[PDB]
Amino acid sequence: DQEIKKLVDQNFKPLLEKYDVPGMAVGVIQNNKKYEMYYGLQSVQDKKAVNSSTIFELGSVSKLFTATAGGYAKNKGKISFDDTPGKYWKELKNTPIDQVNLLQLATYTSGNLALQFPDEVKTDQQVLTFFKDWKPKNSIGEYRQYSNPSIGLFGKVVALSMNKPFDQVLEKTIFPALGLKHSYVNVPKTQMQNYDFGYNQENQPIRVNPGPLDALAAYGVKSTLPDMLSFIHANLNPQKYPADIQRAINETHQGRYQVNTMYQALGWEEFSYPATLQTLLDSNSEQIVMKPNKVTAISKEPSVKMYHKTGSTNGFGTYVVFIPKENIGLVMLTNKRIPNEERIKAAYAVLNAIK
Numbered sequence: 001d002q003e004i005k006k007l008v009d010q011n012f013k014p015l016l017e018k019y020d021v022p023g024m025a026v027g028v029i030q031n032n033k034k035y036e037m038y039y040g041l042q043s044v045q046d047k048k049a050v051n052s053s054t055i056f057e058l059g060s061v062s063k064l065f066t067a068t069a070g071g072y073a074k075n076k077g078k079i080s081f082d083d084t085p086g087k088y089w090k091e092l093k094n095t096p097i098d099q100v101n102l103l104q105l106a107t108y109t110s111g112n113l114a115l116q117f118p119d120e121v122k123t124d125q126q127v128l129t130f131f132k133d134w135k136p137k138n139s140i141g142e143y144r145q146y147s148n149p150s151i152g153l154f155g156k157v158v159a160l161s162m163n164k165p166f167d168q169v170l171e172k173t174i175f176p177a178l179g180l181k182h183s184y185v186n187v188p189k190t191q192m193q194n195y196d197f198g199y200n201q202e203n204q205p206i207r208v209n210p211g212p213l214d215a216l217a218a219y220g221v222k223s224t225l226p227d228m229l230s231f232i233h234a235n236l237n238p239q240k241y242p243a244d245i246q247r248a249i250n251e252t253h254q255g256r257y258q259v260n261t262m263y264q265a266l267g268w269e270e271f272s273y274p275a276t277l278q279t280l281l282d283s284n285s286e287q288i289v290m291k292p293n294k295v296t297a298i299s300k301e302p303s304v305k306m307y308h309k310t311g312s313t314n315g316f317g318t319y320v321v322f323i324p325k326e327n328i329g330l331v332m333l334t335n336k337r338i339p340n341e342e343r344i345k346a347a348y349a350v351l352n353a354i355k
Contacts, residue, residue, distance in 0.1 A: 004028050004035045007353050011346040012332065016040055021336040022199055023050030025225040030328045030354060032237060034229045042335065043196045044203075055187060055195035055222045056333040057208045059311030060148075061318040062221035064231070064252065065183075066155045067267025069162075069174050070106055071251025072244060078161040081106075085131075085153060088160040097134045097153075104141050105154040107256050107264050109295060111138030113147040117212070127152070127212045143292040144259055148218035155217025166217050177245035178234050183223040185216050195222060198315020199336040206315040219313065225333055232322050232329035235307070253307065257295040259288065263302070264295070268309055272302035273323055277348045284310060284340045308347075310340045319343035326355055 012026050016039050023040035042050045073079050079088070081103035086093035100110045112134065121130050131153060159166040162173065167185040175183050187195045197205035208219065223231075235253075238246040255263035255270045261279045263270035269283050287293065308321040317337045322329030330347045 007350045008037050011349040013039055015338055015342055019338045021334050023335045025333045027225045027229040027331040029229055029232055036225055052226050053194045055224055057313040057316040058221045058223055058318050059219050059313045061309050061311035062219050063151055064267040064309055065170055065221050066151055066217040067252045068248045069169050070158045072248035073158050073161050075247035085157050088157045095132050096136055097131050100140055105150050106266055108144045108147045108150050109141045110150055111140050111143055112136055113150040117149050124212045124214055127214045144295050145292040146289055151218045152214040156214050177242050179230055180227040183227045185220055187222055200314055208313040228331040235322050255298050255301050258298055259293045259295055268307040271306050273304045273306040275306055280344050281341055312337045321347050
């Protein structure tokens with residue numbers, strides 16, 4: 001009786017006091033039934049409660065939507081994952097980065113792209129110059145190094161293949177196909193009352209830096225708890241959706257290579273299910289997140305899988321996880337970052353008790 005509420009109150013609610021988080025939204029979906037729990041405030045100053053309309057910055061969870069957009073384009077034949085960027089972004093033809101293919105960009109294996117652009121790369125024109133000046137380092141395809149530039153280039157190519165800027169790819173094609181009505185790249189004026197600053201580690205209000213427009217594909221999406229639960233629902237139960245978006249979602253579930261106990265899918269990290277808590281924590285280790293790691297081609301993909309993704313901005317935290325075989329998933333959104341390990345542990349405690 002009210003198992004989900006009790007588990008969320010036991011495992012997530014104490015994190016607000018522990019880390020002085022102003023507001024948190026936790027959603028659990030089980031057997032196509034969505035449970036939403038909210039704690040605290042969207043705005044400390046205004047005393048406005050965090051609610052089902054509150055818009056949160058997703059940080060790197062934005063990459064799940066870029067991945068879905070790439071899967072959408074690929075299954076309509078608009079791109080091949082074996083293509084290179086210069087086929088679509090013609091000012092990259094005859095450059096060294098035109099030896100990297102789109103799957104390698106989407107899965108962080110170009111061999112010379114770090115977590116962030118250099119600090120001086122602030123505009124899209126500087127982004128293009130950066131890619132023109134790029135030269136290889138490690139063997140292409142061999143090393144995973146988690147990278148915002150890498151995804152940003154993949155998203156730009158996807159947008160070019162769809163004859164629309166990236167913000168419109170998501171806002172006009174992908175979000176509508178998923179039935180998401182309050183997810184945004186650019187939050188409109190009519191929604192600004194629902195989109196407040198997040199809070200930094202000193203509880204000072206802070207908003208994500210726009211960065212060059214190409215970085216929106218890496219970390220620029222904002223969404224609500226009900227929309228994120230709908231997105232999990234689409235990942236668990238795609239048959240309710242348009243065929244082209246079913247194929248896009250399916251594309252993001254296929255493992256592309258292995259690193260230790262993790263499989264890298266498009267956007268999602270993938271694990272054999274059941275996964276130990278330690279396996280899930282290891283996916284967030286400094287070694288995996290910050291360093292190049294040699295990849296291994298998949299022999300046999302696990303027959304039963306689960307998927308997760310963390311994301312943060314300076315003022316927000318996100319965690320999403322789903323388990324097809326159990327028909328369950330969970331989303332956590334906060335307007336202050338908390339350690340990724342706390343998100344993963346709390347979600348593990350909830351989902352493992354509702355099996």
